[PDB]
Design a protein around this nucleic acid. Sequence first.
RNA 1: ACAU
DNA 2: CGATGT
Length: 135
Amino acid sequence: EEIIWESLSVDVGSQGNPGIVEYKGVDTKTGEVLFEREPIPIGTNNMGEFLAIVHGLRYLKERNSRKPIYSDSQTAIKWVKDKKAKSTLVRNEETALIWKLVDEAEEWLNTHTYETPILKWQTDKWGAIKADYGR
RNA sequence: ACAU
DNA sequence: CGATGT
Ligand SMILES: [K+]
Ligand SMILES: [K+]
Ligand SMILES: [Mg+2]
Ligand SMILES: [Mg+2]
């Protein structure tokens, strides 16, 4: 119903899918960019969406912040809930980097706790998530 | 079908 | 138009 403005919003951007993947997190209210991941040469949209949420969790925990995270990705929200990213991307030399990051994000989820609500951004009602790349 |  | 996902 109502946007929770006191929140962090995340989104992925890519050049190709699979292709070059980046992501960022912003203050939902103001749009201030709070973190941005260096582009990863080959990944999928959903791996990026998942890494963005997990980085948001780590960012908020380190800062003792109870803010929720918004993501527009049905898939990534579920992968985080499950602590398991069920990507189809082949494992090879060119995908080694993103798969290492995905593996390590799952490992972090499996070794830490958090109460952070992970909320679905309702794009149909509210427009594009505030972290969107505008691509 | 829904979400990207 | 194509791809990633539940
Ligand atoms: K975009
Ligand atoms: K589809
Ligand atoms: Mg998105
Ligand atoms: Mg977007």
